[PDB]
Design a protein around this ligand. Structure first.
Ligand SMILES: C[C@]1(c2nc3cccc(C(N)=O)c3[nH]2)CCCN1
Ligand SMILES: C[C@]1(c2nc3cccc(C(N)=O)c3[nH]2)CCCN1
Ligand SMILES: C[C@]1(c2nc3cccc(C(N)=O)c3[nH]2)CCCN1
Lengths: 147, 147, 147
């Protein structure tokens, strides 16, 4: 059925997204360390790496919404509505993380540490919120895949 | 011992950024056409391309600020400060365009056309604002390179 | 083919190599954290990422040796000779780090903590040796571009 072709594609997207999230976590931790140590040039490199991975998470989150919107169109009922709603909230949170990371990158480039720290700390908190939604989405999809 | 290399890197970054801006414009035009013609799958492809190019413009704009900030440290004069201020305003505008494109991409994925159209038109306007600052920056750098 | 173009290539290679070394350091830190926290799948991913960056460092080291030998032919200079000797010692050291990282990868795959711990500790010690050599190389290249 198209429904399980879509669920299959969704599992592949989310597996790829998880790998990217692990890379984003590494880059985020490295940026925090460079920031603590006053290594400004190293921090710039780690922030650019984080922004690259965050852009990739954003793309995967968009693809996840598009796939669940497609799944809902093949369903005659609201079985996939909950998963789509989670995925849409995930995407909203991921894009907020992206915007706030951008504010941090610009503040670091502008040499405005107070703005940098505020935005970077928001980015970290949004990432934790996104992680909660990501795991919720995985659980919801497992219940749609049956076997 | 450094400013000439900084200036040459800046010229290379801005040349690469302009090509990316042209590619972004082509993707934007193609997305507008797909939207008007109701071809949602085509629109998704063109929006993903636009988002990729926009992320690259964002990166080049960050690099531009960092290079001009370095130049201002080496040669702390009014020319350098003016160039950096223009580049910082360019980066601000580029990142506003990036966040607005994110809203549009999410709306298209969510099937929310009212939000998509409003955000997409805001994105176009911010792009034109960024173009003005980009050309202003080029004129200032001409005065800084002195041939 | 001219002395100045070869130096320009060397400067670019070492710039790129330092960014790759930063990525290797972030992946290594993330692997250490996953190892300490007992997250074996995360550890496996970060070891694979570290090995990828280590292999890229190895290739930049190869290219640096080749380029310095080319520079000695067209612009003899006791300092290019010094740089080549450092770069060759660096190449040997980064290859040894790659070997020990490979041993760590295999030990994680086999679930052999005793072998893993020894190999990972050796990898760290060799990375610090390579870091010292890389700093010496950067200093020598700075002198080659003219003190
Ligand atoms: C906790 C952490 C994080 N987990 C995420 C899960 C899904 C999305 C994002 C995101 N930023 O878009 C996440 N960010 C580790 C990487 C930085 N923060
Ligand atoms: C007019 C146009 C545009 N010109 C820009 C110049 C600098 C930056 C951006 C940006 N979006 O960051 C620009 N966007 C063409 C490409 C789509 N909109
Ligand atoms: C400090 C660290 C390290 N610094 C290096 C500098 C040049 C080469 C290498 C290498 N392994 O080839 C380096 N490794 C980061 C990861 C653990 N060791």
């Amino acid at each position: 059925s198209d429904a399980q072709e879509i669920l299959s594609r969704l599992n592949s997207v989310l597996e790829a997204a998880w790998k990217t999230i692990l890379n984003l976590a590494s880059a985020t931790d490295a940026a925090e360390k460079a920031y603590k140590e006053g290594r400004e040039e190293d921090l710039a490199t780690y922030l650019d790496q984080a922004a690259s991975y965050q852009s990739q998470v954003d793309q995967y989150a968009v693809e996840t919404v598009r796939l669940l919107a497609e799944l809902k169109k093949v369903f005659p009922d609201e079985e996939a509505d909950r998963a789509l709603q989670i995925a849409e909230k995930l995407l909203k949170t991921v894009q907020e993380a992206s915007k706030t990371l951008d504010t941090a990158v610009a503040a670091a480039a502008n040499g405005d540490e107070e703005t940098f720290a505020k935005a970077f700390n928001q980015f970290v908190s949004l990432g934790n919120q996104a992680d909660t939604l990501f795991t919720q989405l995985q659980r919801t999809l497992t219940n749609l895949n049956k076997k």
